Write a protein that binds this ligand. Sequence first.
Ligand SMILES: O=c1ccn([C@@H]2O[C@H](COP(=O)(O)OP(=O)(O)O)[C@@H](O)[C@H]2O)c(=O)[nH]1
Ligand SMILES: OC[C@H]1O[C@H](O)[C@H](O)[C@@H](O)[C@@H]1O
Ligand SMILES: [Mn+2]
Length: 543
Amino acid sequence: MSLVNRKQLEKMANVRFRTQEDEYVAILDALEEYHNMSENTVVEKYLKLKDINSLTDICIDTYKKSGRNKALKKFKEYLVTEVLELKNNNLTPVEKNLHFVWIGGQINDTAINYINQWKDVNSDYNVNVFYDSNAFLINTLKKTVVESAINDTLESFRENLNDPRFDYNKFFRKRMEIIYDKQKNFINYYKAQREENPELIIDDIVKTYLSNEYSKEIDELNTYIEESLNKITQNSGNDVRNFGEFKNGESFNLYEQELVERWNLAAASDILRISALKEIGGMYLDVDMLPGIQPDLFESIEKPSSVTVDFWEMTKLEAIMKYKEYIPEYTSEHFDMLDEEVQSSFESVLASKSDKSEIFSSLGDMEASPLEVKIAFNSKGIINQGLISVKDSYCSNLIVKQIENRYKILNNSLNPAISEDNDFNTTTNTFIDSIMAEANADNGRFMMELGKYLRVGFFPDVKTTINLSGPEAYAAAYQDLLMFKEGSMNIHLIEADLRNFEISKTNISQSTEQEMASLWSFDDARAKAQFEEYKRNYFEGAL
Ligand SMILES: O=c1ccn([C@@H]2O[C@H](COP(=O)(O)OP(=O)(O)O)[C@@H](O)[C@H]2O)c(=O)[nH]1
Ligand SMILES: OC[C@H]1O[C@H](O)[C@H](O)[C@@H](O)[C@@H]1O
Ligand SMILES: [Mn+2]
């Protein structure tokens, strides 16, 4: 399992009558050094392999027709394998912290109920539910602005809505234009207020705005802030405004951009979660994730052949919540579709258990490499709804830097476009023209995903966040690690590469009810059902 020594590499890369060139010798020296590093940190050894890798590339480029290159390229594969060896063999304890994030408003009971299942089965774990005490009204601001735009849009189309099958995309298109205008109005107000009185907090500005523009009662908004603050305080709340390292770092401006300007709480949470992991260590979880089910629990019950795996995984939790009642209002939509015999097998199994510890597994003493961040997987690949990292892991730093470099590219084209104070369509075109002029061979595909940034949260199937602060930033960091580099923009890693960094599937139950409804995005199917909902809501409005 050891990777090659100096002599073994000289045999490999041997070419009769060719002297060892300086750049060849350099690799050889560096390799022997690496084998003298028993007492060094894993990170120190990774950095050595990184330099060995860099010296190998130099040698290859310096002598492109060399009989050594075939073996040198082989040697590079060995370096990667060694990183995985290093990663898999030098494990340190994961700090016993569970980190949840809920920002922008009051947390609901169902989110708390999911959180308590984890608490209930991981008593040795300190729980953080990150919130922003300056920013409990962002969810209200977005809701009010979007509902206002919904109404203005219907009043624009009117009877044209009847006929024929009017293209519902026209609705969301016109509504985006109105949303962009209102949002710009607020952003302009926020910036004017901050520059007039830097002591003002987001919520002060938001409630004044809501009161001025939407005739909201600030007394009521005040009471909601009060209630939200109290509730999260009682539920392991941890204020972002006290997270000093995060506040003073280069990501905080990105966080606030998503929070205050774009109203994208999932993107804001993407930025927060990884800084929390870097700075504190532990395990990050989305509030719609539940503890792993005990593997032995349902073994005696065979999945019917007619039913898919993901369907079966949903019904397991639905079975649990039906008979054990751990979480109020939990759906049994799928469990109920089953044959009565299979339902009986579930209730007989669950009945033979008296404890929640017999139902959900505990996380226990986990360990992972100082090099890595482990990430959840689903049918579509990596997903950052579950993350595991020791404090200050090398990858956590790689991910933070990916996100920041991704936002730097975004904002370089976006800010000038927005500062021309034009409408949605003009702004969009200007921004895309700039994105296009700035794209090259190795970021092209990333750039194609940015063009859509301005509609995030407001138009169906706009998922740009994924490419900016979400899963693609992690894939890119992993490529950084295994490619011995920084700033990868073209992802070429395959599933098997990324599988190296996976969280064991048994540590998380992903197929939950709340996971089936995205809070920051919505698909075409959902867009259609919203649009018709809005049509009928409005018609019933004579009240
Ligand atoms: O109003 C909100 C909505 C979302 N989130 C955060 O965004 C995460 C991702 O939400 P969701 O699971 O809906 O995203 P998805 O898995 O559908 O991409 C949540 O767990 C929260 O951390 C938040 O803090 N406030
Ligand atoms: O990156 C956008 C989103 O991607 C994934 O769907 C994760 O579930 C979510 O937590 C994240 O916010
Ligand atoms: Mn989710």
